Design a protein around this ligand. Structure first.
Ligand SMILES: CCN(c1nc(NC2=CCC3=CNN(CCCO)C3=C2)ncc1F)c1cccc2[nH]ncc12
Length: 265
């Protein structure tokens, strides 16, 4: 638990998300803070951010945002290390001349963080371009573990009771149809994330309802190749969008396909 006296929050927001500065043992660290109301509080929101903090406490990878901790003060706060450039989709909407090599580098970093998460047997369940935050234009980190789950020791999937309020345009068919979430389900979401990154942060399945997306995917239809997207990257998106969960690659296989150097499998 963090000391409120060591935290300074900026007034101009990024409940709310504020930029702040947290005094460490010697240096001050720039932080991003999710703030929840203490009075008109939503217990389900409080439970979600507590669950998120529990997941973050168990993760340690260069491509996953690091948690500083929780501060219980005039409001309930979840304090993270700041990724200054913010969400990848917004960044690419505002910076349309980022080179192909650079987009490949960024999505490769996400695949490295996801290969770790897969190894760690956690499912992300909200893997979208908005949840990739940029440290620099050459360093991406995965964020928003609010829907993440630690897999049971005897299963490779998390079974939701039924459909909740979900980011359905990023979900694999087994998620929509059977409410089963595996690291393979995150690979499908990663394919949608790739499409977003090569479409300079455009929304996937523009103008379609979730039910229309489900019917499109069941028919074997997929989003078209983004204008100017490298052919090899579009091919990798289609492999990520393998309908059958058993034939879809895991993140180890996907991460290999995003490397820009010779390697052995
Ligand atoms: C996305 C908000 N955010 C972060 N945010 C940032 N950097 C940002 C830098 C600039 C920016 C502009 N907009 N946003 C998104 C605000 C949330 O809607 C921005 C985020 N770095 C690290 C972060 F951790 C968070 C803080 C606390 C808990 C959290 N869980 N999931 C994300 C998150």
């Amino acid at each position: 638990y963090l000391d409120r006296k060591l935290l300074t929050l900026e007034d101009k927001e990024l409940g709310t998300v504020k930029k702040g500065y947290y005094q460490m043992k010697k240096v001050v660290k720039t932080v991003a803070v999710k703030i929840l109301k203490n009075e008109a509080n939503d217990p389900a929101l409080k439970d979600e951010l507590l669950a998120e903090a529990n997941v973050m406490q168990q993760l340690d990878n260069p491509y996953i945002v690091r948690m500083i901790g929780i501060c219980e003060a005039e409001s309930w706060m979840l304090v993270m290390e700041m990724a200054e450039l913010g969400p990848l989709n917004k960044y690419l909407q505002q910076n349309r001349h980022v080179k192909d090599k650079n987009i490949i580098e960024l999505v490769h970093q996400v695949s490295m963080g996801m290969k770790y998460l897969e190894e760690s047997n956690f499912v992300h369940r909200d893997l979208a371009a908005r949840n990739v935050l940029l440290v620099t234009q050459h360093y991406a980190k995965i964020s928003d573990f609010g829907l993440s789950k630690a897999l049971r020791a005897d299963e490779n999937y998390y079974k939701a009771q039924t459909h909740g309020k979900w980011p359905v345009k990023w979900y694999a068919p087994e998620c929509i149809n059977y409410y089963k979430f595996s690291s393979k389900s995150d690979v499908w979401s990663f394919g949608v994330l790739m499409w977003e990154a090569f479409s300079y942060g455009q929304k996937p399945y523009r103008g379609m309802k979730g039910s229309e997306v489900t019917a499109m995917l069941e028919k074997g239809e997929r989003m078209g190749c983004p204008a100017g997207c490298p052919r090899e990257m579009y091919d990798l998106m289609n492999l990520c969008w393998t309908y059958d969960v058993e034939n879809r690659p895991g993140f180890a296989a996907v991460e290999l396909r995003l490397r820009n150097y010779y390697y052995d499998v």
